[PDB]
């Protein structure tokens, strides 16, 4: 049949996050915009720029 099994996903910026899969978030590699604090945690942060 098929097995496409796109192995990540993409989400915008106020994302639904299932607890038990936060610590597997995939950081926006090379972005213009950093992460303050360790995104394991989920919730509201503040991001530096650039």
Same mark, same amino acid.
Do not use: H, W
């Given at each position: 049949? &098929?097995?496409?099994?796109? =192995?990540? #996903? %993409? %989400?915008? =910026?106020? $994302?639904?996050?299932?607890? $038990? #899969?936060? &610590?597997?978030?995939?950081?926006?590699?090379?972005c213009r915009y950093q992460p303050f604090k360790p995104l394991?945690? !989920? !919730?509201?942060?503040?991001? &530096?720029?650039?």
């Amino acid at each position: 049949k &098929k097995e496409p099994e796109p =192995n990540f #996903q %993409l %989400l915008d =910026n106020p $994302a639904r996050v299932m607890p $038990a #899969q936060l &610590k597997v978030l995939t950081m926006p590699e090379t972005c213009r915009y950093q992460p303050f604090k360790p995104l394991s945690i !989920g !919730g509201i942060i503040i991001l &530096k720029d650039t």
